[PDB]
Design a protein around this ligand. Sequence first.
Ligand SMILES: O=C(c1cc(-c2cc3c(cc2C(=O)N2Cc4ccccc4C[C@H]2CN2CCOCC2)OCO3)n2c1CCCC2)N(c1ccccc1)c1ccc(O)cc1
Length: 515
Amino acid sequence: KIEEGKLVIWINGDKGYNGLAEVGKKFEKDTGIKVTVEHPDKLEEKFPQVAATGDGPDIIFWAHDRFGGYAQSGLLAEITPAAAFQDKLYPFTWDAVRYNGKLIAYPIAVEALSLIYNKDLLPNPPKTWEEIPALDKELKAKGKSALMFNLQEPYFTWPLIAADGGYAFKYAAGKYDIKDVGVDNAGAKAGLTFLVDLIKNKHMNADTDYSIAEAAFNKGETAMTINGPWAWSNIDTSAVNYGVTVLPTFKGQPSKPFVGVLSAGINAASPNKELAKEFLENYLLTDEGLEAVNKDKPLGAVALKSYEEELAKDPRIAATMENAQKGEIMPNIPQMSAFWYAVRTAVINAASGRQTVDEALKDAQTAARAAADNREIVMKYIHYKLSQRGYEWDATESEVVHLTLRQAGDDFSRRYRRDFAEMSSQLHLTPFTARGRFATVVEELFRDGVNWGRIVAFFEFGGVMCVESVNREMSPLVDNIALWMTEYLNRHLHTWIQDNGGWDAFVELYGPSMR
Ligand SMILES: O=C(c1cc(-c2cc3c(cc2C(=O)N2Cc4ccccc4C[C@H]2CN2CCOCC2)OCO3)n2c1CCCC2)N(c1ccccc1)c1ccc(O)cc1
């Protein structure tokens, strides 16, 4: 149970929590409501665990992308700000905190990648990607290089890939279409081709990661880099006099980095939702409230119009907001993990020369489509198991695979009914060890090999954990178990299924039994 009468606030350690504590002290001074700010390690995983049992803080601070999964599992309360308060923030920041047509958090700050340049080696930064090769040829004559940024994570290379038309997921009617991916299209191919062309022309090295690029710019060895506000403090202490400006354009079109919006969500189980609403609207989201946090650790660009216009006097903050306005809001669905996993391998394989740009992106398009299909198999099965025990979950010829799989699971549960009853009763299920308990059992099931019988047991165990989660008043755990089953399907079971005739072969083997 969360204590009523006080506000407990969680925010990451790399933020200005001491400045946020000042706002809480001012709130406590005016109203007597005690405000406690904490920065637990790995709070992005710690919050859904404590919130799954109705515990945890009253207010959670994190990027908006994780709040979609939080809201789907019912961890966040719907905020109800008046129209006069919503006008005080930029409209696109409210779009980042809207899930299923409901606002689930208050926007605080805006964060996106920018072009960081060395003002000594490069007084006037290039406005286009195309003039970077010629810029590198002149710098190589002095022992320097033009650009060095992280090529191992697709978050840093995506603004160039998305510039000519690449997109992660299509957005229609307030919902992301996870089957409409845009890594295969010509815009993404043209952007990734230019990146690989830079590597082929020796302007960049395919092995450059975050640390190599940061160490290169912070020592004056390269003239430019691509990073966010989190890296400004390392360059401040260094001898490099750096500037921050808009990302270079590609084919006359702006680079489109993904925008992360630091947001404050209200715990759905908190008994102080009104006090939290009053604190966030009338104390934090003010010029004085944001200044106290920004003085401690800079927030970059902020969602509050009045204070953003003040922070924009520093050109590095205006450049952060400009690149965010030209980019795209990070999709707030857990299905982005499959997108990043596919695009990362596509960029890695294309840069090293193992595959062409066309093949690497086609493999990424099919990998994203396969992740959506495996998610469909998991969620249809879990929804059937939960409905069997009377629990609804919010999340005939074409359904032959789904109908055969659930009957095979029912046959497995019926054959070992007594064994399932003992296991389900004696199961050690907590939100803090559920993932480890799941991964341990799945390792045992497939240690001596993968077969269709063990896959049926794999699905049936995930259904048992979901049923036990709802029985033990931990229903938000069902959404996490479904994601764990989908991730193991995509990463480990998918190749065996493909090499053994696909799910059509499963129907042909188990189908005859069901007559
Ligand atoms: O530890 C397990 C478990 C279940 C099976 C298993 C998988 C199969 C199968 C068979 C069994 C199996 O061996 N059992 C089925 C079963 C079902 C439900 C509860 C317990 C058990 C234990 C035994 C039953 N014994 C041996 C056979 O004769 C009857 C007595 O046929 C095709 O696929 N296996 C393991 C561990 C690795 C070997 C195979 N769970 C587990 C997990 C946590 C805690 C305890 C057991 C587990 C994993 C997935 C599940 O869907 C269900 C159980």
